[PDB]
Amino acid sequence: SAVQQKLAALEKSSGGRLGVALIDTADNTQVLYRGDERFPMCSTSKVMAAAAVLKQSETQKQLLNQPVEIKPADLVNYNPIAEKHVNGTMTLAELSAAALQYSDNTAMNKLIAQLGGPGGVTAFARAIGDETFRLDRTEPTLNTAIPGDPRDTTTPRAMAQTLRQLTLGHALGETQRAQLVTWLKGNTTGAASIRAGLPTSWTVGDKTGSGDYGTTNDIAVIWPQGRAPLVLVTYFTQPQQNAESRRDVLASAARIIAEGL
Numbered sequence: 001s002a003v004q005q006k007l008a009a010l011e012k013s014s015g016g017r018l019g020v021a022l023i024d025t026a027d028n029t030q031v032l033y034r035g036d037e038r039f040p041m042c043s044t045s046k047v048m049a050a051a052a053v054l055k056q057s058e059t060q061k062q063l064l065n066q067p068v069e070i071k072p073a074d075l076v077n078y079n080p081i082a083e084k085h086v087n088g089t090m091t092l093a094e095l096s097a098a099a100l101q102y103s104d105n106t107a108m109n110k111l112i113a114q115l116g117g118p119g120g121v122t123a124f125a126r127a128i129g130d131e132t133f134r135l136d137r138t139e140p141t142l143n144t145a146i147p148g149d150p151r152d153t154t155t156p157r158a159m160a161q162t163l164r165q166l167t168l169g170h171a172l173g174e175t176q177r178a179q180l181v182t183w184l185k186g187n188t189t190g191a192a193s194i195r196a197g198l199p200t201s202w203t204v205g206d207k208t209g210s211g212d213y214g215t216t217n218d219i220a221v222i223w224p225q226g227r228a229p230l231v232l233v234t235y236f237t238q239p240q241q242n243a244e245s246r247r248d249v250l251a252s253a254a255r256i257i258a259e260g261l
């Protein structure tokens with residue numbers, strides 16, 4: 001299609017490797033570009049950890065209000081919210097919000113601990129039918145994004161399907177799903193990524209990710225005004241370990257997708 005030609009051209013112009021998956025929930029049609037290639041997830045993995053904790057809260061009804069102590073040893077490389085609560089507590093809800101809306105790495109590590117390790121996050125993915133997602137490490141090392149390394153990767157197609165199930169489907173209970181959507185819609189880190197390629201009238205919930213090798217990711221649910229929602233995953237990584245982030249590539253890929261609708 002035109003869109004796949006334009007995405008290929010965008011990729012060629014960027015010097016990196018671009019993966020895109022769009023699901024249009026109107027007709028369950030899909031647009032894929034490198035849809036079955038593995039990409040480092042970086043912080044887009046935080047959606048799965050938060051959702052796994054939400055799933056636990058369907059049975060442990062008070063779980064999200066459970067206080068979790070933030071100690072100095074807990075702090076890693078990027079903790080905008082956890083830093084504000086060192087030697088205090090945050091609830092699991094506050095930690096989930098921080099992981100998603102500010103990409104707080106300490107918050108993510110607390111969610112992983114709550115789940116019994118990276119294997120507990122991966123188990124949740126398997127439980128909801130995602131056989132591709134794998135979380136192997138904690139923060140910050142899950143962002144190394146080494147070419148060819150399968151650790152901490154998924155594919156665009158898999159992530160789009162899973163994000164659809166978590167936000168628009170019923171992998172989560174009704175209250176949990178609504179909470180996840182509310183958290184994604186309040187993301188603060190996404191203004192230069194998918195959102196920037198879309199009409200300002202559209203409502204977007206997203207989670208960005210960034211890592212080494214110039215890895216620049218964003219996964220989003222999109223509610224166009226008067227139209228069925230869309231799920232869009234854009235993964236991008238580059239050949240140089242110290243490459244700069246390229247959020248503009250994600251914006252451009254979204255714009256190309258939005259043109260084709």
Ligand SMILES: *[B@@]1([O])O[C][C]([C][O])O1
Binds near residue numbers: 105
């Ligand atoms: B994820 O990728 O988003 C931000 C943080 C910085 O390490 O991790």
